[PDB]
Amino acid sequence: TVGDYQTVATLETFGFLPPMTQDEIYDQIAYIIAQGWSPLIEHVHPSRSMATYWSYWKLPFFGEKDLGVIVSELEACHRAYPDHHVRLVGYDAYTQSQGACFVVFEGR
């Protein structure tokens, strides 16, 4: 029906766009590393999705300059938790903030 817009539940960033291709994850990870940030993986049960602290996996990749490891550490968190959201974060140590924060896997 047009035009009847239905409110949809989203995560936050990149939520209105379709799920990312493997090649898109490559370029977002490469951008995160090229800014000098630290990657960090999280996950929750989709019901606890509004908790203030998700769950780590396993420790932030401090000083990692290779994106071929993070694309394999993302299938590990997903296979270990096939009903969890899998978020990707980019830690900024000088500002104490996050330069990136987008869900990669949505939770089967």
Binding site: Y5, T13, F16, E24, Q28, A100
Partner: protein, 445 residues
Amino acid sequence: EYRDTYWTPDYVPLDTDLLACFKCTGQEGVPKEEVAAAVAAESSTGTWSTVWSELLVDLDFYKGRCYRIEDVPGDKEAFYAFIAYPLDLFEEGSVTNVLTSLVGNVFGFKALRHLRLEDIRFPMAFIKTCPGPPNGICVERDRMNKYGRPLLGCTIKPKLGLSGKNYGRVVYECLRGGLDFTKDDENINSQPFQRWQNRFEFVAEAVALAQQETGEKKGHYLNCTAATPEEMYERAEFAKELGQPIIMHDYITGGFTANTGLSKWCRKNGMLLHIHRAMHAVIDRHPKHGIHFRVLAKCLRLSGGDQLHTGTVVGKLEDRQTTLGFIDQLRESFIPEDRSRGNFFDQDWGSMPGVFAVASGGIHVWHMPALVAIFGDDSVLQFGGGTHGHPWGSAAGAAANRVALEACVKARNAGREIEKESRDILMEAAKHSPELAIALETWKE
């Protein structure tokens, strides 16, 4: 009495001084050293007369002195006068005092045809006495959980007429469709057709019912500008009791005294403060008279407030270098000296938090790649009719900007040129959203 007792070309300002820049041109014939010396005098001691009393004081210590004369590039009768003021002339943590002293009287003085306050260097000894932003950028993103992208807002329209319940009806539609803030217009105070305890209470329901349906935190800046300070605090405390995260105030028309009292009420109570720069064009607009908006942005960062209107986007306020100049000063912690962006001084803020740069006034969907390339991520984008002006309503309108924003971010990260490939960052996004696909047809192009 002839001055050049205020023209010290050999003086080297202390690190505790308060410097100032004036773009000036005086009467015909008088040399520049005299006329800049008159600006030095009339903004500090305004003297020498001849009195018995003016010898009870060491007045060479409290005098303001002009240590540099420079020529405006592109003009001949004008010049730049850099003047230094001792730290003792001002009250601590008082921005009402620093302006009353500087611009309080010199603008009426007769020997100057044109005088413009361009910049001020505040010393670190003065900055640490002021309250500053109640929260800042990094604390606001923490409390709201919004990372990696600029925030989005809307201003509810019609400004004049809606009851307390229809207001909340339109607030509910824009929030439930993709935005995260809505705004009270500057006019909305407590008019007969909509008292403030009725607007505050029905908005509190539209915000709380859209926060639960989307699963995201949402807000609405409620206007707590009033006629008295007892009234302003009363609205602030009503809004906090209703569980609301953010409010609003008009600092130029409500005054810095009220703005600083509200800004320190927000720290003890954990609220956010959004600032509207009403009646700014009366002072700031004309290029040879008054104060630059840069100086009123520094005074705002010192007084309080976490977001400040910078506007104005049709298609923008326009040069871009001047705007990017005082966006640096609202956000960064150390700003070097660059004349292209009109920073005359090196300004260090130490550890004082930054302030969100709000862009506003007439944005539409084709302006996103130019407003993401210019402003970055620590910005708020507030449309008035960009959300509401969509053929299918106010929720389908918000759903089209939130899709076009997140498509411009994810294309900035991936190394693409957003302000240059704007049409394929948008038409390839409308392939996966019929709400944006129809918005691109209306506001063409």
